[PDB]
Amino acid sequence: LVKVNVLVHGEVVDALTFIAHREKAYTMARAIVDKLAEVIPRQLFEVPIQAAIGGKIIARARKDVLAKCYGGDVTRKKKLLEKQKEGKKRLKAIGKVEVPQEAFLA
RNA sequence: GUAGCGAAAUUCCUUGUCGGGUAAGUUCCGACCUGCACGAAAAGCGUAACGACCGGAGCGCUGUCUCGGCGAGGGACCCGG
């Protein structure tokens, strides 16, 4: 029966996982795990909430300023491209919570 | 770098998260504090009244727009110059 869990950037997530018996691990993985996407996205980080059932992960479930200095500089584009790129590393980390549970449970 | 204020006639990231105001808002208000790059005399913070200033919000009244319709007269037209 084991105890198939799940993963979601954070940890422990809502409150799933039971007992994956008879390959039942991935059996429902591509099902429940792929919970659409919590209906709500919250931010543009795109956290990857996998399924820490008991591995070894299993399941596998941003402003637009860049184009404004138009017509040139595959240079300066990059300059302003890194600015926000740094936030992600400082966001997902500092941006505690990021847990939008209590959606539909499906 | 004290106080004090803070995502503001400064916050890149980045519509930043919580909150409210509204059907739903990157607008604004409130706090939030990671102050990229605020800061004590190139003060700031507060702040009455005053303002042909910027910002929201609501009520009113209501052809901007929802869709116009007709009229009025001065040209625009034909002839005369």
Rounded CA–C1' distance between A42 and B31, in angstroms:
21
Q: What are the b/e assignments for A16-25, b being 16+ CB within 10 Å?
A: bbeebeeeeb
Beta strands in chain A (DSSP E): none
Q: Which nucleotide is nearest to A85 (CA to C1')?
A: B13
Residue A69 CA to residue A38 CA, distance in Å, equals 35
Residue (of A4, A3, A80, A96) closest to A45 by Cα position: A96
Rounded CA–C1' distance between A95 and B32, in angstroms:
13
Q: Which nucleotide is nearest to A68 (CA to C1')?
A: B12
A91 touches strand B (CB under 7 A): yes
- Joined together, the tokens standing for residue A44 give 């543009």
A40 touches strand B (CB under 7 A): no
Residue (of A48, A38, A58, A57) closest to A92 by Cα position: A48
Separation of first and last alpha carbons in chain A: 22
Rounded CA–C1' distance between A84 and B76, in angstroms:
61
Resolution in A: 5.7
